[model samples]
Target chain A: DIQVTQSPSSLSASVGDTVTISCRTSQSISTWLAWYQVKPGKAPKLLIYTASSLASGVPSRFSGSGSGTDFTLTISSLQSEDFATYYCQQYISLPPTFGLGTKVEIKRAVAAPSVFIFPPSEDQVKSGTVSVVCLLNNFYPREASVKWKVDGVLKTGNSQESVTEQDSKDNTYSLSSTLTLSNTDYQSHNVYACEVTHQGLSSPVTKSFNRGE
Target chain B: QVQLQESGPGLVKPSETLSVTCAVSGVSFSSFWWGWIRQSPGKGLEWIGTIYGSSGRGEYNPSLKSRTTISRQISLELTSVTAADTAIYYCSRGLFQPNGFSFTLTSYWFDVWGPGVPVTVSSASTKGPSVFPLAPSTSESTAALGCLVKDYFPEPVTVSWNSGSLTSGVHTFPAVLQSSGLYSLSSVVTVPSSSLGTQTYVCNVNHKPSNTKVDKRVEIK
Candidate 1:
C-alpha cells in the first residue's frame, strides 16, 4: 500500500467559492487514485476516480487532476450541500488506501459551532491538576457565550477565548477556550459540561465530560 | 439487487478473537466474491481479506495472513484482537469476471458495500520498541532497501525512511500481525546506485500510543 499525505486538515469555505485539497502518495500511483466526500453521519460518496475523472452524477464543479505521486481535488464553486469532508484514496494495489481527509466547512452567515472536549489523561486524572479544553470552530457572527457546569449546576473555571483567527483561504473565523479545573473537583463524583450559547442556535449547544485522568 | 450487512460484537478483550458475519440477501451465496473491509477512526479503509464463495478459500493481505482468516460464505475472524483491530468492519460484494480468454476467473473490485459494524478491543496491547534489520536487496534496476520492525504490540507503528541521498522511491507495506498477537511492519525504499554513501540510511519507527521512537541507521561501508 502507498502512504498518502493530505494537507490543510480543515478549511472554511462559502458557497460560490472554489476550494482545492491536495494528496501526495509515497509512490507513483499513475492516476490510480480516487476521491470521496463524506457528510456528517452519512456514508462517504465517491466523487472522482483515476485521479481526474469525475464520478457519474457528481457536479462538473467537482473535478480532479494530477498523476504519479501528486493529485488534487478541486471544487470550482462550493455549494451549500458541499459542506462536508473530502478524502483521497489510491486503488493501485491489492488493499486500496485513502488519504487523511480534508474537511470543507461552510463559511456561514450563521453557523452552528462544533464542540470538542479534551480531558486530562488518565495519569493526570489520578494524581495531578487536570484541565479540559473546548474548541468551537468557525462559528459565524462572533457573538457566542461559553458556560461551564458541574453536575448540572453553574460552575466557573478559568477560561480565555483566543483572538479570532480567520481562514484566509475561505472566509471564516475560529476560536477556542480552555477550562482549568482541579483533578480533585473532577474526581468528586461530578460530571462536567461546556454549554455554548449563540443566537444562531435556538438552544445552547451542550457538551459533557466525566471525571477521569 | 444483492444486499450485504455486517454484524459483529461491539467489543472484544485483548488477546481474544474477533468474529464478524456478513449476511447476504437477494443474491445467491455462491454467485460472487465477498470480502471484509474495515476503517478505524481517523484512518483509511483497509481490505482485511477476501473469499470466493465458490471455493470457500480466501486470500489475505500478506501482512494479515498469519492472524486473519475469511471463510464460510463471509465470516471474517481475527485470531487475536489487538487494540489495532478495533475498527468499523464492512462486508462488500465484488464481481468475478473472465480475464481475457483465460478460463480462470478473476475478481476485480468491490462494487457494493454494506453498512459497517464497529468493534473495539478494550485492552491496550503493548508491543514494539524492537527494531529488526534491513539489508539492501534488489530485483532488477532499482536498489530496494527493506526494513522490518517486529514485536510491536497494540498494532500501530509507522515505518519510514530518511534516505539522505537516495532517489526517494519509498512504499511502506501493510503491517502484518504475527501468531503471537504482535505486529511486524516492513517498508522498502528504492534508491539509485549513487544514492548510498558514508552518510547513514535511517529508518524511523514511531509508535504513537506509547510515544516510542526507534531509529535504525545503517551506513554504507
Candidate 2:
C-alpha cells in the first residue's frame, strides 16, 4: 500500500481563478492517478484519468500533471459549478487508495449569514427538556461555524444536527441549529447566544435568546 | 532517530500460523509502543494490535483477539488463517502521554511506519461474495447508488448497475483483501436523486472465482 498525501486540504477561490492541488505518494506509482470532484452529499465525478487525460465530458478547465511520486491537479477558470471537494486516487496496487481530499470552496461569497434565535415555546419550556432554535439565513460559500454560548461558556455535545437549505432564487443558503437544555438550565439567568462566522464576515455575529419570565 | 523494517515470510498456507517481526534500530526498545497495522480491501488501515516495549502490556483488535498474540520480540502471531488474510502488513510506532489523571497512558497516533511487506495466504476458497447496498441519498438532486461486496475469494469480480456496467457516472474500486482472508470492494453509480425517490436502483456483482452472481437493490421515498 502506497502512502498518498494531499496538500492544502482546503482553499477559497473566486470565479475565473486558477488553482492547483498536489498529491505525493510515498513511492512511485507512474501515471496511474485519477482525479475526482464532488460536492457535499454528492457522488464524486471522475475529472481527470491517467494523470493527464480529462475524463469524458469534463470541462477543459480541469487539467493534471506530474507522475512517478508526485502529481498535480489544476482547475483553471474556476466556475460557480467548481465549488466542491476534489480528490486524487491511485490505481497502482491492490485495495486502491484516495487522497485526503482538497476542498475548493467558491470564493462564492458576497453575503454573510444573518443569525436569530427562538426561545422555547411555552409548552416546550415546560417539557423538562427544552429545544431552542438558532436560525441562520442568507449565507454564501455553503457553510458556517455555529456555536452556542451560555454565559460565556460554549456548549458542546448538546448542540444538535442542523438542516441547511438553499434559496433557488438568489442562491443564498439557510440553516437552523438547536441546543437542548433542561427546563432548569433555561430558567437560570445565564444568557444563551448563537454565534456564526463565515468567510463573508470579519467578525462573528451573535444573537441572544430573548425569553420572558 | 529510529529505523524500522518488517521481516516475515511472503507466503503462508491456509490453516497455518503467520508471524512477522518488526526489527527496530536507532531507538531504545523500551521507549515506545510497537505495533502492527495491516491494510486490506477496506476504507482504513486495520490496527492488528499494540504492545508497549518495557511493560509488555498489550491490546489487540477484538475481532482477531481470539487467535492473535504479541510478544516483546515486537512480533505478531496470527493463528489459523484462511485466504482472507492476504494483505500488506506494516510495523508501526505509537507514542503516548499520560493524560495527567490516573497515570494512564493515552495513545497519540501512529507517527512512523515501516515499509510494508506483502503477505499472501495462498491456495483458494470458493466462498461466494456477500453483497450489501451503500446508503442511498436522502441529496444534491442525485443519489450515489453504492454496492458493497465482501468476503469473497480469488479477487476477480465485476460490478454493474441495472442500467449497465461502467455506464456513465460509475466508479468501481479495485477489490481489496480483508484481514479475515477474503476480498471486498464498493462500487458507486450516480443517478438523479428523484429517480430513486420514485423508483429503484439495482447493483449486480459477478464473482468469477466462486462462480456466483448477486444483485442488491436500493430504493427510497
Candidate 3:
C-alpha cells in the first residue's frame, strides 16, 4: 500500500479567499489520486477521483491537479460552508492508504453586521410595535455574543433572543437576534443598537437604527 | 419461465453435515446447467459448482473442489461441516454459450435463483437424517427412496439400501456434497410395491476412516 502525506494539517481562511492543499505519495502513481471531504458527524464524501476529475455533484470550485507522486487540491473561492477536513487517497496500490487530513477553518470574524427593523412600512411605524433584528452571517469560531441597546443605554436582559445556525457548506455560524419593541418606543425618536462581540474584532461591532425614520 | 425452490434442514451440528435439495419446475431439468451458490453471513456470493443433468457433467470452484459434489438430479452435497460454513444456500441456473467449432458449452453467471435457505452449523442444534420417497417410475417399476442424511461429521460415508431381501435390482448413487461441507447420499431400491412392504430400506452410512456408522430407514406405511 502507498503512504500519503498532506501539508497544512489545519488552515484558516475568510470567504473569497483562495486556498490550496498539497498531497504527496510515497510512490509514483500517476493520476490515481482521489480526494474526499469529511465533516464533523457526517460520512466522508468523494470530491475528486482519478486525480483531476470531480465526482458528480461536487462543486466546480473544488479541483485537483498534478500526476505521479505530487498532487494538490484547490478551492478557487473559499465558501462559507467549505471549512472541513479533506483527505487524499491513492488507488494505484492494493489496500490504499489515505493522507493525514487537512482541516480548513474560517479565519476572520465576518462582514459588518446587517441591521434591519421589521415592518418598515409607514403604517407599521404609525402603529408602533416593531422588531429590531441584527444578522451576523458567515462568521467563524462560533464564539460571538450579541447585546442590545436603546438610545446608547445598555439594555440588560431585554426580550431579545439570538438564534445561531451553522452553514454546513462552509462551517460558518450565523447569528440572528430579534428584539421586540413596544409601540411607545417606536413612536418616539430613538436609536436602537445591535452590538456583537467576538475574538475576530478589535471592539464590539454595532449596527444602529433610528425609529420612525 | 423456470423457477427453483430449495428444501433442507434448518440447522446442523458442528462437525456434522448439512443437506438440501432444489426442486425445479416450469423448465425441463435436462435442458440446462444448474448449480448451487451460497453466501456466508455477510460475504460475497460463491459459486459452489454446476452440473449438466443430461450428461452428468460437473464443474466446481477450486477452493471447494475437494469437498463438493454436484449431481445430475440438480442436488448439492458438501462434506465435513464447521461453524464458519454457516450460510444461506441458494440453487441457481447458469447461462451457457456454446462454442461454434466444437459445439462445446461454457457456463456463465446465474440468472434464476431460488429463495435462500439458512443452514446454521452448530454443535447444540444437532439432528439426524431425513428420508423422503420420490414418485416411482411406472414403466421401470423402480421404487426410489431419497435418503437425506444430514448433520454428521468426517463426511466420507457409505450409504446403502439394505439389499438383503432383494434377489436382484439393488443400486446406490454416488454421495452428493452440501454447502457446509457435509454429506447427503441418496439411494434407490428397485423393488415392487408388494416387495417394498415386505422389505425394510436402511441406509448404513459409514463416516470412515473411523468406520463410524449411523443408520436411517424408510418403510412403507
Candidate 4:
C-alpha cells in the first residue's frame, strides 16, 4: 500500500481568489489518484480521479491535474460556500488509502448579508399555433441536474444541450443549456426547476421559473 | 445453460485442510477465466483470485495473499490450504472481450455468479472430532450450513451432502458458499417433530481435482 499525504491541512481563500493544494504519494502511483470533498453528515462526493479526469456532474471550478508522485487539486475563483475539507485517495496501489484532508475556509466576512434571488424560468408557445425557444443560461457547476415540470407534474421533455465555456479572467467556467418546447399554451404557472449540485456546497440549489403571458 | 452442484463433508478436523470444488456443466475449458471469491460470516466480500482458461495467469487477494495459489487443469482448479482461509467460496467466469472501450469492457461487474458453495476450515482431529458451536448442527429445525475447498488442477471437487429422511417442502434452502482458493456450500434439512428425539444426519463430499473424487460422508446421530 502506498502512503498518501496532503499539504496545507487547512486553507483560506477570499471570494474570487484562486486556491490550490498539493497531494503527495510516498510511492509512484501510476495514474490512479482521486480527490473527494467530504462534508459533515454526508457521503464523500468524488471530485477528480485518474489524476486529472473530472467525474460526471461536478463543477468546472473544481479541477485536478498532475501525476506520478505529485498532483494538485485547484479551485479557480473559490466560492463562499466552497469552504470545506478535501481529501485525496490513491487507487493505483494495492490497498487504497485516503489523505487526511484540507479544509477551505472563507477569509473575508460580508459587510451585509446579500440574499441572492435565483428563481425558476421557462419558455412557452401558443398551443396549436407556434413553438418557443427555451435557452437556459449562466449555470455553473456542470453537474447542474435539471428537470421540466408542466402543471406541477414533471414531464420528461427533450433535454437541452449544454456547453461549458472557460472564464479566462479567473479561469473558472460557465455553463448553458438549451431546450425547445412545442404547442405550449398552458393556463397555470408552469414550473421549470434547474437543480445544481457540487462536491463542496451543502445542498442542491434549485432555481425555479414560471411561464406567464 | 449449464448448472453446477456442490457437495462436501459437513464437518472438518481443526488444524487440518478442508477442500471442495465446483462442477461446471455447459462451458468448455477453452474459453473465459474461471475465478473464486469468498465472504465470511458478517464480513465484506473478498476476491480469492482468478485463473485464465488459456493463459494460466492467477491473481490473489492481499488479505489472503500468503499461503494461497490458484491452479487449473482440464476443467477445475484447486487453491492451497489453511484455516483463516475459511469462508463460502464461489466460482465464476469473466467474459472475454477482445474488443476494447465497449460497454462490457468498460464496466465489468460479475455478469454471472454461481449459487456459490460453502466450506469451513478446522484443525485435524482423529479422536471423536468436537465440532465448533458456531458450526452448523443436525437438528429438528432447519439451519444454514457451509463448506470450503482448496483448488487443485484437473477438476475442482464437487460437494453435496446427503442429509437423510427430511420432508422436502417448506424447509429453508442452503446458500452456496462463494468459491475461493477453497470451495464452500450450505443446505438445510427438515426434521419431523416426532423424529427429532432419535434422529441423525449425514454430509457427503465429492471432488475430481486429481481426476478422482475423495468421497467422504460424515454422520451426525
Superior by TM-score: candidate 3 or candidate 4? 3
lDDT of 4 by residue, B1-221 (tens): 54444445544454444555556667676576666655554343455656676777755557656645565631223345555555566565533332234342211123244655666564432221111111112323333222222223212344344433333321212122222222222222323344433644443334443344332322221
Error of 4 at B63 (Å): 6.2
> For each candidate, what's the DockQ?
0.06, 0.02, 0.01, 0.01
Q: State the lDDT of candidate 4 residue by residue for A1-213, as single tens digits.
A: 467889997775778989999999998776677787755323345677777888767789988998889999999988855767788877553345567788775453222110111221221132222211222222232334444455556656553333333222332323322233344333334555544454333665544445441
Could you tell which candidate, 2 or 3, scores higher by DockQ? 2
Model 1 alpha-carbon drift over 4 Å, by segment = A109-213, B26-31, B94-110, B123-221
Report the Cα lDDT for residue B24, model 4.
60
Write one digit per residue (lDDT tens) for candidate 1, span B118-208. 8877653665556543333222343444455556666568777763344344445455444445655555554554655533578887998
Q: Looking at candidate 1, what is the lDDT of residue A158?
A: 63
Q: How would you order the candidates by lDDT, starting with the best?
A: 2, 1, 3, 4
DockQ of predicted candidate 1: 0.06
lDDT of 3 by residue, A1-213 (tens): 467889988787878989999999998876777787866534356688777988768899999999989999999998977878888876553334568789787664454332222223343345454444455555567666888878888776534343333444545555545454567765563777778887667788776766644
Worst 10 residues of 4 chain B by lDDT: B127-136
- Give the Cα RMSD of candidate 2: 17.6
User: What TM-score does each of the candidates earn?
Assistant: 0.53, 0.45, 0.31, 0.29
Where does candidate 1 chain A have its weakest 10-residue lDDT segment?
A163-172
- Give lDDT tens digits, candidate 3, residues B1-221: 76788888877776565777888889789878788877665343456777776887867866777778777647777888887778888787755544336665433344566777778776542224433332222333444443433334433455665634432433343333344454444343445555565666666655654446666565432
Which residue window of length 10 is worst by lDDT in model 4 chain A? A111-120
**Per-prediction CA RMSD (Å):** 22.7, 17.6, 32.7, 27.3
Residues A11-32 of candidate 2 have per-residue lDDT tens digits of: 7787888998999998887777
Of the true interface contacts, each candidate retains a share of: 0.14, 0.00, 0.00, 0.00
